[model samples]
Target: ACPEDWGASTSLCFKLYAKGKHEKKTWFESRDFCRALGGDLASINNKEEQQTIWRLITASGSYHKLFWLGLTYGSPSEGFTWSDGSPVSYENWAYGEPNNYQNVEYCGELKGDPTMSWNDINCEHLNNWICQI
Candidate 1:
């Protein structure tokens, strides 16, 4: 069932921010928003869940930036990880990505460099995001 501001799917609550410039949030801010709302930033537990979220992001129609995903890595040796401490199992990385691109990049985004897929981003970039409860 859908919670007040959340849409329902697979018995989970989700909200995607598809608004214009004014509503974008940085990775930290987005995660905090989700926490304040009684949810964690979404974690894709399986491939189906991954694509479900991907579909939603694609349909949002904002081609400007990749949506913030609940994934991060503290160091290259630490391995990429889910923000919620879930398994770092499912990944949809774009070509040659997660280069950590100079080692400063630590956040994750569902990137669309040329096609929609996963890419690591800097945590400070402002963008639309999704949340799950």
Candidate 2:
């Protein structure tokens, strides 16, 4: 079962700290908030998990807002990885995304586009974020 105030599926719990409703934070600061809750930033491992998250935000009317995820990039050779250290077996990037635009986009964000795909943005940008456990 999931904790109180958190949305849940059969085996997961998620909490969306939404914009305007919650304090927006930079990517690193967002993860700190999740960790303090005894969880971590969300790690979307498959299509089903991704869709579940989509439904969550859509129902909350947050699908059109950018939310931080737990994914990040290291050096060129290291590539992207989740905060939990899980292999990125599934990906739902926006077209031409993870582009590291301006070479400063290192943190992952759930895009605000209609497709609800992912994007790599600057880690310092303030945004809403989701957490999971």
Candidate 3:
């Protein structure tokens, strides 16, 4: 079973919190919040896990909100990496995504679109986020 209020998928416990805009946080703040809860921002592992996450998102009625993930493009040389320090072998970016739009997008988010694909945004943008352990 998963943690008290967290949803379970496979073996991981995941939670979606602070769904309000007033509770949104920057990338760093979001990571801090998740870590404080004893987990970290969630990282997608595969297609099934990705589908689970999207189902959770839609079920929560947050269809118009973006949620941060553990992905980042801190260095162009290093490409995109998860906060968990895992290799970014699996990806779910939308068409023309991670374009580093305006060259200011270094953080990754589950874009609030029909595809639920990933997008690169400025790290400082306040947004909701997910956690997993």
How close to the true structure is residue 10 of candidate 2, measured as C-alpha lDDT? 42
Query: Sorted by TM-score, highest first, which candidate order results?
Result: 2, 3, 1
lDDT (10s digit) by residue, model 1, range 7-77: 53365566777557788999999999888977878776776776666566566655546678788775657
Q: How well is each residue in 1-133 modelled by candidate 2, as lDDT tens digits?
A: 7888676434668777886745799999988988988888998888777777877877776457889999888667889988877887898899898798888999999975558699999999999999997
Model 1 TM: 0.82
Compare candidates 1 and 3 on TM-score and give the better one. Answer: 3
- For model 1, state the Cα shift of residue 22 in Å: 2.4
In model 3, which regions exceed 4 Å deviation?
A: 112-114
Q: lDDT of each prediction vs. the true structure?
A: 0.74, 0.83, 0.83
Candidate 1 regions exceeding 4 Å error are: 8-10, 58-65, 112-115
- Worst 10-residue lDDT window, candidate 2: 5-14
Clashes of 2: 0
Instruction: Give lDDT: candidate 1, residue 53.
Output: 62
What C-alpha lDDT, on a 0 to 100 scale, does residue 81 get in candidate 2? 85
Per-residue lDDT of model 3, residues 27-114, tens digit only: 9999898888888898887877687777777777757678899998856689899887778888999788889899889999987556
